[PDB]
C-alpha cells in the first residue's frame, strides 16, 4: 500500500572515519515497523551505497506510528566498516560471525586457577603423576 519515504536529517560528511553520520527519518503509514534490513537494502540509491557499509542504529518508533527516527552510518568501504564498527553491530548486520568465548564466570574461574598456580602445566602434571603413584 505504502512504499515508505526515507529522508535523512542532520547529515555530517565525517572524514575522520570516512563514514557518513546522519539521522535516519522513516515514514511508514499503515506499515508495522521499518524492518531495518529493508531500510539497509533501500540505502543504495541514496548515497551510492552497498549492503555491507550501510549501518543503522537506534530506530525507536515514534508514538502514534508512521514516523520513526534512527541513526545511520554509511562507510566508504566494507574494509572501512570492518575496522571502525563495533563487532556486535557487524554480527547483527550479518558480516562478521558471532564471536564465541565462554560464560564470563567460567573465564573468571579459569583466570583464578591460573593465578593459584605457577608454570606452564607440564611440571604440575608430573607432580600429579608422582602423587598418583605415591
Amino acid at each position: 500500500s505504502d512504499a515508505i519515504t526515507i529522508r535523512t536529517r542532520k547529515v555530517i560528511s565525517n572524514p575522520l572515519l570516512a563514514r557518513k553520520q546522519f539521522v535516519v527519518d522513516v515514514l511508514h503509514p499503515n506499515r508495522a515497523n521499518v524492518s531495518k534490513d529493508e531500510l539497509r537494502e533501500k540505502l543504495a540509491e541514496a548515497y551510492k551505497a552497498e549492503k555491507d557499509a550501510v549501518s543503522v542504529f537506534g530506530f525507536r518508533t515514534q508514538y502514534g506510528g508512521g514516523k520513526s527516527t534512527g541513526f545511520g552510518l554509511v562507510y566508504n568501504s566494507v574494509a572501512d566498516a570492518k575496522k571502525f564498527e563495533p563487532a556486535y553491530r557487524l554480527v547483527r548486520y550479518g558480516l562478521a560471525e558471532k564471536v564465541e568465548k565462554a560464560s564470563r564466570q567460567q573465564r573468571k574461574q579459569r583466570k583464578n586457577r591460573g593465578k593459584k598456580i605457577f608454570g606452564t602445566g607440564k611440571s604440575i602434571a608430573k607432580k600429579a603423576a608422582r602423587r598418583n603413584a605415591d
Binding site: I12, S13, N14, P15, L16, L17, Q21, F71, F84, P86
Partner: protein, 260 residues
Amino acid sequence: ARGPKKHLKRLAAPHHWMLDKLSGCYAPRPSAGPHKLRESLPLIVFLRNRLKYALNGREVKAILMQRHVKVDGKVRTDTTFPAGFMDVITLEATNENFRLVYDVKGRFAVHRITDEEASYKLAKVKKVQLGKKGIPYVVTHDGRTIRYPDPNIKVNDTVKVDLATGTITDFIKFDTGKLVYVTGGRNLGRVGTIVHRERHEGGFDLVHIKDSLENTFVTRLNNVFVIGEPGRPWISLPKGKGIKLTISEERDRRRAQHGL
C-alpha cells in the same frame, strides 16, 4: 587519603563541558597536562559532543590512534589530553582547524579557522626565571617553556609561539588601553580594552575592563589574557564578537530570529 585521584565522576566534572549528567556516571578526567584541570578541556569531551564527530569512546579512540588528530604540533596518542586556552587543533582530514577559545557565555565554542591563523598560538607569560649557566627562560600559560626570549618580557605579557618550533616571533606588552580576553570566573569570555590597573601588595591584583557597550567589569590578573591593540585582535573571535550580552538582548535576538 593514600594517593592521587585517577577516576572522575560525571557530576564532579567542571561545568563548561556541559556533559550529559544522566547518560554515564564517570566523566573523562583529563590526564596530567599543560593547563589546570579546571581550565582545561579534554579531547573526548570535545570530539564526541562539541563536534559530534564521534558517538562513543571506542569511536574516539579509533579517531585518535589512526593519527589524523593533531593538537599544537604533535599528535597526542592518548584520549584524555588537556587542551585549554588558545590551543590549536588541526585535523588532517579536510584540514578542519580549530583554536580553543571561549565564547560569550563561557563555553569552548567550535571556532573553525584556516591554516593562516592556525599556525601560531598565543601564550600568557606565567614567570621569567634565569636558569642554569645564566639563561633567561619564559614560561607559557600552557606549562611550556621557551629559553632565550626578548629581555623586555615581564609577567602578564602575551607571546606568539609558531608551533613548528618553540620560538617567539612577537609579544604584546601589558598596557592599560590594550584589548584583552577574560578566561575565568563569573565574567568569562568577555572582551575589553583595560581601563586601569590596581597594583596591590601581597597577592591578588585587579584590573578594570571596559567593553564596546560601556559596561565596566573588574577582574584578577590570573584570568586576564592580552590579545593585542584596541581595535585589532590577533585571534578571530567567536560569533557575536564575544561580548557578554544582556538577557533582554538575548531574548530580543531569539524573538527576531524565527527564520526557517
